[PDB]
Amino acid sequence: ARKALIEKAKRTPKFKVRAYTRCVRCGRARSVYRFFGLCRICLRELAHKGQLPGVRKASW
Amino acid sequence: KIRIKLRGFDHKTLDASAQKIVEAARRSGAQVSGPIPLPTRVRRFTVIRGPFKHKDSREHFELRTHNRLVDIINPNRKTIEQLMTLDLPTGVEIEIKT
Amino acid sequence: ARIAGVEIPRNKRVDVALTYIYGIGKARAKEALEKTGINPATRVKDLTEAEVVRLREYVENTWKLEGELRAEVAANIKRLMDIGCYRGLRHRRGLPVRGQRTRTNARTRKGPRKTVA
Amino acid sequence: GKGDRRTRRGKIWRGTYGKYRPRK
Amino acid sequence: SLKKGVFVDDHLLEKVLELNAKGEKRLIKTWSRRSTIVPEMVGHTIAVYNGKQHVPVYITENMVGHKLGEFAPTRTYR
Amino acid sequence: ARRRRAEVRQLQPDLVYGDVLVTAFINKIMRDGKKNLAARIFYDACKIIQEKTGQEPLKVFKQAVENVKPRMEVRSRRVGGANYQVPMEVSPRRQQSLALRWLVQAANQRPERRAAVRIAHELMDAAEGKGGAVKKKEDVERMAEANRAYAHYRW
Amino acid sequence: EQYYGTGRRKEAVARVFLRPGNGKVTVNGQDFNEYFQGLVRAVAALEPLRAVDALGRFDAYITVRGGGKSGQIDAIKLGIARALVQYNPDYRAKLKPLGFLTRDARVVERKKYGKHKARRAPQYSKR
RNA sequence: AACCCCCGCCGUUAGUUGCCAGCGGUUCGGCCGGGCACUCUAACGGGACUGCCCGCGAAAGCGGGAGGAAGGAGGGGACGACGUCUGGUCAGCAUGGCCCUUACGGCCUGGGCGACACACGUGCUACAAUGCCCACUACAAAGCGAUGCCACCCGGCAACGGGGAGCUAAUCGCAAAAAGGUGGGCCCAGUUCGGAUUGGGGUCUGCAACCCGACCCCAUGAAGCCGGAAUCGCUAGUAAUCGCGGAUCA
Ligand SMILES: [Mg+2]
Ligand SMILES: [Mg+2]
Ligand SMILES: [Mg+2]
Ligand SMILES: [Mg+2]
Ligand SMILES: [Mg+2]
Ligand SMILES: [Mg+2]
Ligand SMILES: [Mg+2]
Ligand SMILES: [Mg+2]
Ligand SMILES: [Mg+2]
Ligand SMILES: [Mg+2]
Ligand SMILES: [Mg+2]
Ligand SMILES: [Mg+2]
Ligand SMILES: [Mg+2]
Ligand SMILES: [Mg+2]
Ligand SMILES: [Mg+2]
Ligand SMILES: [Mg+2]
Ligand SMILES: [Mg+2]
Ligand SMILES: [Mg+2]
Ligand SMILES: [Mg+2]
Ligand SMILES: [Mg+2]
Ligand SMILES: [Mg+2]
Ligand SMILES: [Mg+2]
Ligand SMILES: [Mg+2]
Ligand SMILES: [Mg+2]
Ligand SMILES: [Mg+2]
Ligand SMILES: [Mg+2]
Ligand SMILES: [Mg+2]
Ligand SMILES: [Mg+2]
Ligand SMILES: [Mg+2]
Ligand SMILES: [Mg+2]
Ligand SMILES: [Mg+2]
Ligand SMILES: [Mg+2]
Ligand SMILES: [Mg+2]
Ligand SMILES: [Mg+2]
Ligand SMILES: [Mg+2]
Ligand SMILES: [Mg+2]
Ligand SMILES: [Mg+2]
Ligand SMILES: [Mg+2]
Ligand SMILES: [Mg+2]
Ligand SMILES: [Mg+2]
Ligand SMILES: [Mg+2]
Ligand SMILES: [Mg+2]
Ligand SMILES: [Mg+2]
Ligand SMILES: [Mg+2]
Ligand SMILES: [Mg+2]
Ligand SMILES: [Mg+2]
Ligand SMILES: [Mg+2]
Ligand SMILES: [Zn+2]
């Protein structure tokens, strides 16, 4: 229940509300931002790689 | 008449390029109001630093979107064709109204 | 005066008086006043006798209440009781009727704490 | 209080406008 | 609480309406517990599901506006 | 608080009498940062101050605060073993903070409904002597003189 | 003729325009004794005047906006201080010693993560 | 430590933000003429270094004073050593070994994670008069919105429904910020405090609100008169208190 489950979230062969968020890299379901389409985890890895342009370690 | 908007992430390049246009357009045509730095759009994103049970010490960063403004009042063709081949951006968002 | 035919709010503002009537609240309190032309601030004690009948006749006929109201609310439950629905069975075990918490709290429908352990 | 499901302070806290508060 | 169109899965009526013809039986397994009890549904026997099995719950004119699921308990300790 | 003696926090003088003491007393009345009421409420009392007595509220306040200024109190200690209640001196800074606290605390202890009348009556009775806030002062002063025995360990 | 001075405090900012005249003073419409009715610290911003005696000798049209009400009065407390010190150099001699010329760094602290109010930590336990 | 960021003072670059500050006009709303003063706006700089006076001292440095928006780290953040906890997570992902393979894998419908005789943690709302209610009136910051936020008028007690303008946004909207100001009523009562509970009626989302959503209106109004032993946070724009935003998402 991990691969056939990320596949389920892709086809959308059925009703509206049933479709839901999902991470692009991993396949997470919770803590998945729409902006990037990524889970909070990898987003932090990538943001440390600079692979997310404009993003920078904020501080104030 | 003509107007230009320059949204961009890296304010470093968006500041120098905002200068380039003012350099040419002015020194070859009508009057051009100086660069107006608009209020920046900012999207922060706090996120649990760890991959698990550690709801605190969570790291957070931002994604600024700077805006700069410049206006060419009279569409002199002398500036029109130069500001159409002299430019050379890399990540700036230029737009033009009328 | 004995307005509700049984209930007897007195010696305090009329607008709050009928509130103490069962089946009457803050809303119908403000309505009954206007729907019979009556000063809200005036006290129940010092008031026109004719007005007494007026306020009484109105509310006592406009909408049912009291013992018959209570038996009405109780009937709506009696049916649930006999009907065999999930809504009634929560009145049965005495549990909440909103599917709300039961692992904790819900003391209001469970009464005081039974403890034991 | 901020708990009364039927008043100003209540709708202010609850996040709704409702009858007991202005609208359109 | 829903008001425009008192929803109730079609396969419910599609199965029971033919019963309204020759006034046939009532034995039939069901799943649309989220459906309303049809006004014309009186006098029948839809075995509602609860996650374990079908409850042979009989209907009466008193149980109508309510959902068909109500009369099919899910928690095993009623 | 182990390092320095920590500078005493200076407060802005009154915008009605110019004395820092008045505002300090105002702060104890205050609640949840609602400093608006406290000032008003204090002056509200002053209004009732003159109505009752011909005295000005400024002096009656200073008289009330003085009569509730505890000269000595008791503080617990550990003699490397047991635990007495040593009687001893009282810092000037403290005498005020207390004379104001008890004043406010005892102020609310009164039966009256409106707060201002409670602080007005309290301030009168305090300036007089029969004030309840004055009792919390007369009372504490005893504790000290009773234990005058354990004064040897004054430190 | 005129005078001027800005006043910042808590996002709030204020331009102070001075003009010789009566006691007339009004910020952004509304009589001053109306834009600060019921508020006791109202006369605070005007305090800078009682120092120079010019309480009854000057008028003022003020433009203040941003931040909360009370913080504004302090912005004017400094805005006016910058004013009468402007078109009057040697007036400074007895205006800084009295303390009226300072931005007042005091500002609201940013809420921290793992906290409740930048400092108020959550309820500790062990059970 | 310092080099980076926000917040304090200031200057230069910038004029669709801003102001009769300046004159004119005005349907007297910065709406028009008009200007960069100011406010604001986001770029680069300037300034603070025990540099100056005094007392001690070998020095480092400390104590006091002047000037300064700001003095010895000005306030806040980012940043957390060699390591320790056989700490945490193979369920985010990766991975050695191990196990199943018409199955320990896959599809759906319905159920459960929402179960309640209890116990602990974290929290919300209150027990009221420094208060509650109703009407009127003023002041924020930071944020988000084109199959999305919706001004304005109509219906409705209301949530909402319909018509319909503006807006790839310092130009339009979410948008009354609340406490507070003024006015008015309540007069110490389990009360106009308190809204738990529940009966009935109803709006929205979404195939679908029994299990199991949220919101509105009427009615019903519980425990609770400051909390046993014990225990928590906070040293300044902090605690306390008041309201607003966003992520997540039908
Ligand atoms: Mg799989
Ligand atoms: Mg979803
Ligand atoms: Mg609990
Ligand atoms: Mg509408
Ligand atoms: Mg209902
Ligand atoms: Mg219906
Ligand atoms: Mg078919
Ligand atoms: Mg705060
Ligand atoms: Mg210069
Ligand atoms: Mg003019
Ligand atoms: Mg002039
Ligand atoms: Mg005119
Ligand atoms: Mg204009
Ligand atoms: Mg003109
Ligand atoms: Mg520049
Ligand atoms: Mg320094
Ligand atoms: Mg030096
Ligand atoms: Mg030196
Ligand atoms: Mg010498
Ligand atoms: Mg040396
Ligand atoms: Mg030497
Ligand atoms: Mg030397
Ligand atoms: Mg020194
Ligand atoms: Mg810091
Ligand atoms: Mg470091
Ligand atoms: Mg049990
Ligand atoms: Mg335990
Ligand atoms: Mg109102
Ligand atoms: Mg209004
Ligand atoms: Mg405003
Ligand atoms: Mg945005
Ligand atoms: Mg969209
Ligand atoms: Mg219309
Ligand atoms: Mg409607
Ligand atoms: Mg209407
Ligand atoms: Mg609509
Ligand atoms: Mg229409
Ligand atoms: Mg259109
Ligand atoms: Mg726009
Ligand atoms: Mg617009
Ligand atoms: Mg708006
Ligand atoms: Mg009582
Ligand atoms: Mg009474
Ligand atoms: Mg359906
Ligand atoms: Mg109680
Ligand atoms: Mg404990
Ligand atoms: Mg500390
Ligand atoms: Zn991921």
Q: Is B54 helix (H, G, I), strand (E, B) or coil?
A: coil
- Smallest Cα–Cα separation from F97: which of F120, F118, F73? F73
Ramachandran category for residue C47: left, alpha or beta (phi over 0 → left; psi -120 to 50 → alpha)? beta
Q: Is C66 helix (H, G, I), strand (E, B) or coil?
A: coil
- Strand-pair partners of B60: B46
Nearest C-alpha of chain G: how many angstroms from B56?
5
Q: Domain E1-78 is in which class?
A: alpha beta
CA-based end-to-end distance of chain A: 42
Give the CB-side neighbour count of residue A20, counting CA atoms within 13 A. 10
- Strand-pair partners of E28: E46
Q: Are B66 and B14 in contact (CB under 8 A)?
A: yes
Give residues 45-104 of chain C lying near strand H (Cβ < 7 A). Answer: 69, 72-73, 76-77, 80, 85-87, 90-91, 93, 95-104
Mutate which: E36, E57, E71, E75, vs C, most C CBs within 10 A: E71
Give the nucleotide at minimum CA-to-C1' distance from A4.
Answer: H106
Q: Is G90 helix (H, G, I), strand (E, B) or coil?
A: helix
Q: What is the DSSP letter of F55?
A: S
Instruction: Name the one residue in this structure whose structure tokens are 């009372």.
Output: F139
Ligand nearest the Cα of residue B64 is: 31
Mention every residue, 6+ apart, whose C-beta is less than 8 A from residue E43: E26, E59
**Measuring CA to CA, how many Å separate B25 from each of B16, B71, B75, B84, B98?**
15, 10, 10, 11, 16
Query: What would the two tokens of residue F123 be?
Result: 């301030």
Angle between helices F92-109 and F20-29 (to 10 degrees): 40
Answer whether CATH 3.30.230.10 is correct for domain G1-127: yes
Q: Strand H: which positions are within 7 A of a protein CB?
A: 4-10, 13-16, 19, 21, 38-43, 67-70, 74-80, 88-89, 92-93, 105-112, 114-127, 129-135, 138-144, 151-160, 169-170, 176-182, 185-188, 191-200, 202-222, 231-244, 247-250
Mention every residue, 6+ apart, whose C-beta is less than 8 A from residue C79: C88, E62
| CA geometry: angle G107, F42, F125, nearest 5 deg | 140
Query: The domain spanning residue F38 has which CATH number?
Result: 1.10.455.10
CA-based end-to-end distance of chain B: 5
Ramachandran category for residue C36: left, alpha or beta (phi over 0 → left; psi -120 to 50 → alpha)? alpha
Residue G83 CA distance to nucleotide H51 C1' (Å)? 31
> How much distance in Å is there from the Cα of C21 to the middle of ligand 5?
24
Q: Are C40 and C14 in contact (CB under 8 A)?
A: yes
Mention every residue, 6+ apart, whose C-beta is less than 8 A from residue G78: G5, G7, G8, G9, G48, G100, G101, G102, G103, G104
- At residue B68, φ and ψ (nearest 5 deg) are -130, 150
Resolution for the entry shown, Å? 3.4
| Cα–Cα distance, E45 to G57 (Å, whole number) | 96
Residue D19 CA distance to nucleotide H184 C1' (Å)? 22
Q: Please report which helix (H) or strand (E) contains residue G104, including its range.
A: none
Give residues 68-127 of chain G lying near strand H (Cβ < 7 A). Answer: 68-69, 72, 92, 96-97, 101-110, 112-113, 116-125, 127
Nearest C-alpha of chain C: how many angstroms from E51?
16
Q: Is C33 helix (H, G, I), strand (E, B) or coil?
A: helix
Tell if the CB–CB gap between F16 and G41 is shorter than 8 Å.
no
What are all long-range contacts of B41-44, with beta carbons under 8 Å and residues at least 24 apart?
B41/B7, B41/B65, B41/B67, B43/A35, B44/A58
Q: Please report which helix (H) or strand (E) contains residue A50, including its range.
A: none
| Number of domains present in the structure of chain F | 1
- Smallest Cα–Cα separation from F103: which of F47, F150, F45, F148? F45
What are all long-range contacts of F146-149, with beta carbons under 8 Å and residues at least 24 apart?
F146/F87, F147/F74, F147/F84, F147/F85, F147/F86, F147/F87, F148/F87
Q: Are G111 and G104 in contact (CB under 8 A)?
A: no
> How much distance in Å is there from the Cα of B76 to the middle of ligand 40?
29
| Cα–Cα distance, G8 to G64 (Å, whole number) | 9
Q: Is B88 on the interface with A (CB under 8 A)?
A: no
Q: Are D13 and D23 in contact (CB under 8 A)?
A: no
- Smallest Cα–Cα separation from F131: which of F149, F118, F146, F113? F118
Q: What is the DSSP letter of G56?
A: G
- Strand-pair partners of G62: G16, G27
Where do the structural domains in chain G lie, given as residue ranges?
Answer: 1-127
Q: Are F96 and F102 in contact (CB under 8 A)?
A: no
Tell if the CB–CB gap between C86 and E70 is shorter than 8 Å.
yes
Q: Which amino acid is at B40?
A: T
Q: Are G100 and G57 in contact (CB under 8 A)?
A: no
Pick the CATH number of A1-60 from 1.10.357.10, 4.10.830.10, 1.10.1370.30, 3.30.460.10: 4.10.830.10
Give the nucleotide at minimum CA-to-C1' distance from C23.
Answer: H219
- Smallest Cα–Cα separation from A44: which of F106, B61, B27? B61
Q: Which amino acid is at C35?
A: K
Query: What would the two tokens of residue E59 be?
Result: 């209907």
Residues of A forming the annotated binding site for Zn(2+)? Answer: 23, 26, 39, 42
DSSP helix, strand, coil percent of chain B (3-state; round to 5): 25, 45, 35
Where do the structural domains in chain A lie, given as residue ranges?
Answer: 1-60
Cβ-in-10-Å burial (0-12, 13-18, 19+) of E75 comes to exposed
Q: Decide the pairing of beta strands E27-29 and E45-49.
A: parallel
Tell if the CB–CB gap between B46 and G113 is shorter than 8 Å.
yes
Q: Spell out the domains of chain B, with CATH numbers in brackets.
A: 1-98 (3.30.70.600)
Instruction: Name the one residue in this structure whose structure tokens are 């001893």.
Output: F88
Tell if the CB–CB gap between C86 and E73 is shorter than 8 Å.
yes
Q: Are E63 and E37 in contact (CB under 8 A)?
A: yes
Instruction: Tell me if there are at least 3 CB pairs under 8 Å linking chains F and D.
Output: no
Strand H atom within 7 Å of G17 CB: yes
Query: What would the two tokens of residue C69 be?
Result: 């109201």
Over chain E, what HEC string results? CCCCCCCCCHHHHHHHHHHHHHCCCCEEECCCCCCECCHHHCCCEEEEECCCCEEEEECCCCCCCCECCCCCCCCCCC
The residue segments making up the domain with residue F5 are: 1-155
Instruction: Find the CB nearest A47 among B51, B61, B65.
Output: B61
Where do the structural domains in chain E lie, given as residue ranges?
Answer: 1-78
- Smallest Cα–Cα separation from E9: which of E72, E69, E75, E73? E69
Contacts of B56 in chain G (CB under 8 A): 113-114
Residue numbers of C between 38 and 97 with CB closer than 8 Å to E: 79, 82-87, 89
Give residues 1-24 of chain D lying near strand H (Cβ < 7 A). Answer: 1-20, 23-24
